[PDB]
Chains A and B, each alone.
With several copies, the nearest count.
Chain A
Amino acid sequence: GPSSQNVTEYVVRVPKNTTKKYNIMAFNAADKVNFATWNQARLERDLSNKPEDQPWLLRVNGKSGRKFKGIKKGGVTENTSYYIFTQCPDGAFEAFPVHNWYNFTPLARHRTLTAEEAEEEWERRNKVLNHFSIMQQR
């Protein structure tokens, strides 16, 4: 059929400027990120430093859902550029430079030991009993 020898060629357009900047969001494969449950999400700059040069914080489904932290790619693409092709009704490809690259990793939510609490465990760090029990006590 035609698919056995189909040939597709489309024009490339590079708008001089766009109101919205383009950046790449990357999720590790082991994270098994799924967008079906992403009913709501929040993306904002971090508050630990306390803006344009600070890490980004991603929250999904408010506090109930998983939380991810994005960090700008330190390595710069001085000799390289990245572009994204998006299908359009006119049938011509459009390429947008990648303003930034961000790597997001999940943040597990649970009663993580506080800094003060960890000090007590440091005494028994070398010799501890029933690693499971330590979390139950906390």
Chain B
Amino acid sequence: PILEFLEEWSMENLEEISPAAIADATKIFVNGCWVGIHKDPEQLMNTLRKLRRQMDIIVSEVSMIRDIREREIRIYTDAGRICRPLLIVEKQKLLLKKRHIDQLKEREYNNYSWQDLVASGVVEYIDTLEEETVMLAMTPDDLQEKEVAYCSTYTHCEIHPSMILGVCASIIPFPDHNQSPRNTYQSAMGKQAMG
């Protein structure tokens, strides 16, 4: 489905191009295979992102990476890519609105669940390769608020910073007040506890 869409759009196949044209156009890779080239990489990425966020041809776990400096667009669709959900930011504003929270609050007897957030295009998964091209906000209330403009092009926002921890590190209370090795020791001890 990824390749069919690219062919439909203005992606010139490798066979049907002259090598002189590879200079200006951005290479398109799908699962590591060089499919073709594109002249409008910015519009292609916008279209690819829009389709993925709509649960269109591109599925949620498909990761599109653009190397602007290297003039390469890499699309990955295979297994084993580790990704995490992040809130989408547009114009320094979360796409997650109060209406989404209200629907979530009545999670039961309403059929609204996490998938509707992904379907709504408010939260998307970002793999480690795609995270390199992402400008990430730790919190919405401190990072993308009107202030000294350290950065005004945030593309994503962490749902909560504490999600970087695992199961065993998530039971440590105030782990940010501890010296880090002692948080590692507890993760080992917490597995040997009794209960």
Interface of B is mostly: mixed
Q: Which residues of A contact B16 (CB under 8 A)?
A: 26, 73, 101
Closest to B4 in A: A79
Whether A101 pairs with B15 at a CB distance below 8 angstroms is yes
Pick from B4, B13, B18: contact of A29, CB below 8 A. Answer: B18
Smallest CB separation, A33 vs chain B (Å): 13
Q: Which residues of A contact B14 (CB under 8 A)?
A: 75
Q: Is A23 an interface residue (CB 8 A)?
A: no
Q: Which residues of B contact A51 (CB under 8 A)?
A: none
Q: Is B78 an interface residue (CB 8 A)?
A: no
Whether B15 pairs with A29 at a CB distance below 8 angstroms is no
User: Contact string, B14-29, partner A, CB cutoff 8 A, digits 1/0?
Assistant: 1110101000000000
Whether A80 pairs with B18 at a CB distance below 8 angstroms is no
Q: Which residues of B contact A101 (CB under 8 A)?
A: 15-16
Chain B: interface residue total (CB-CB under 8 A): 9
Whether A75 pairs with B20 at a CB distance below 8 angstroms is no
Whether A79 pairs with B7 at a CB distance below 8 angstroms is yes
Interface residues of B in 7-58 (CB under 8 A from A): 7-8, 13-16, 18, 20
Whether B15 pairs with A74 at a CB distance below 8 angstroms is yes
Q: Which residues of A contact B7 (CB under 8 A)?
A: 77, 79-80
Whether B20 pairs with A29 at a CB distance below 8 angstroms is yes
Q: Which residues of B contact A78 (CB under 8 A)?
A: 4
Whether A73 pairs with B15 at a CB distance below 8 angstroms is yes
Closest to A29 in B: B18
Whether A75 pairs with B15 at a CB distance below 8 angstroms is yes
Whether A79 pairs with B8 at a CB distance below 8 angstroms is yes
Smallest CB separation, B34 vs chain A (Å): 11
Closest to A73 in B: B15
Q: Is A6 an interface residue (CB 8 A)?
A: no
Whether A75 pairs with B18 at a CB distance below 8 angstroms is no
Whether B13 pairs with A75 at a CB distance below 8 angstroms is yes
Interface residues of A in 63-87 (CB under 8 A from B): 73-75, 77-80
Query: Can you give 21 A-B contacts (C-beta < 8 A)?
Result: A26-B16, A28-B18, A29-B18, A29-B20, A30-B20, A73-B15, A73-B16, A74-B15, A75-B13, A75-B14, A75-B15, A77-B7, A78-B4, A79-B4, A79-B7, A79-B8, A80-B7, A80-B8, A101-B15, A101-B16, A103-B15
Footprint of A on B, CB under 8 Å?
4, 7-8, 13-16, 18, 20
The 8 A-B pairs with the shortest beta carbon distances in the complex, nearest first, are A79-B4, A73-B15, A79-B7, A75-B15, A80-B7, A29-B18, A75-B13, A79-B8
